[PDB]
């Protein structure tokens, strides 16, 4: 009954991976967090009444192609594809992450959620409809999050968990 969900948060540098993760765990906004730190975190939550154990891997940059690093990622059951809305290139890298995720799990069917972060900014360079379209071509939801105001943070993570249930219960 006490079930485990292993989530991986991926994305380009500065998109808010550490920001979104720490908001979910420690319930506050970290201003300037070390970009190199890659850690796992654990949190007990109640999603749709079910008490769940959340293990989240907040990835940090230097992507590697050692076998163990692949083994490290295969442990992930869901993947938050995170980009910033004021970063045109972080959105262009989304497919570069999705291809690598499918490669390590060897599957065309991997639970993922597309996340546009920093939705509190007045300046925006990535249109919402532009990301709606890309999400449909993958079959995954799209969440408009802001780690600074904690808007849609739980919504984005909880959705990834729900996208995991509809995979082991098929």
């Amino acid at each position, epitope marked *: 009954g006490m079930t485990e969900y292993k989530l991986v948060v991926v994305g380009a540098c500065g998109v808010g991976k550490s920001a979104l993760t720490i908001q979910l765990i420690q319930n506050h906004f970290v201003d300037e967090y070390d970009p190199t*730190i890659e*850690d796992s975190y654990r949190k007990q939550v109640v999603i749709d009444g079910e008490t769940s154990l959340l293990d989240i891997l907040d990835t940090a940059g230097q992507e590697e192609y050692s076998a163990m690093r692949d083994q*490290y990622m295969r*442990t992930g059951e869901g993947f938050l594809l995170v980009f910033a809305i004021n970063n045109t290139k972080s959105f262009e890298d989304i497919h570069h992450y999705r291809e690598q995720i499918k490669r390590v799990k060897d599957s065309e069917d991997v639970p993922m959620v597309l996340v546009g972060n920093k939705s509190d900014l007045p300046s925006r360079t990535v249109d919402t409809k532009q990301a709606q379209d890309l999400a449909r071509s993958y079959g995954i939801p799209f969440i408009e999050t802001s780690a600074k105001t904690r808007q849609g943070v739980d919504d984005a993570f909880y959705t990834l968990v729900r996208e995991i249930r509809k995979h082991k219960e098929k």
Partner: antibody
Amino acid sequence: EVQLQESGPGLVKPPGTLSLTCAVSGGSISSSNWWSWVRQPPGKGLEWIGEIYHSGSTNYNPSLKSRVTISVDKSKNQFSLKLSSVTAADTAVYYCARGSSSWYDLGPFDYWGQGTLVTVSS
Amino acid sequence: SVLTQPPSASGTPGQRVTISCSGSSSNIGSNYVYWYQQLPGTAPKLLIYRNNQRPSGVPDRFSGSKSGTSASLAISGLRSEDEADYYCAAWDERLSGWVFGGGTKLTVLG
């Protein structure tokens, strides 16, 4: 690349209390890992001391349980060791380490500090 | 040490050497075994995890296995750089603690 560095007195006189601190860099003390202390007498083998989780939960080597305290200080991103009533048998190199990953178990000691010789003498 | 290893092992270069580790039902019989390599003056380094899996930089010629209450480390392509101290470790259910073997100093002869 989380990094650990142990700091503490090099000499402790008996009845006294050995106190050591491990400063952690490149990684949060609040990650889902277990923070251990290990020691090694010079020329001899490794001996586990105890463990702490960031929630405060601990596990100690039973043979040392009555003398050992391990603490966590999140404000300084540190964990520490207190070993009371030291004797010559506590002369050793004391490593701090991180392991028991919870995301992907590699064992109890994934990353190690360098060491700092602690000599118990009169 | 709660686990048992021979204090020393020997091998001529190129040949295969074995390092044993004896436990009981509380530790090796019930739990995974991990192996660590320690060079002089440095902290130990993970060599084998979960009985037989290798981390990065650990070459093909290092292999582990576990049978019953006993474990074994095998080094085939024996090089001079393998001179080191080797330790097995496991969780002990009866003691509720991590336990080590006494360590084995490997000597490359010739």
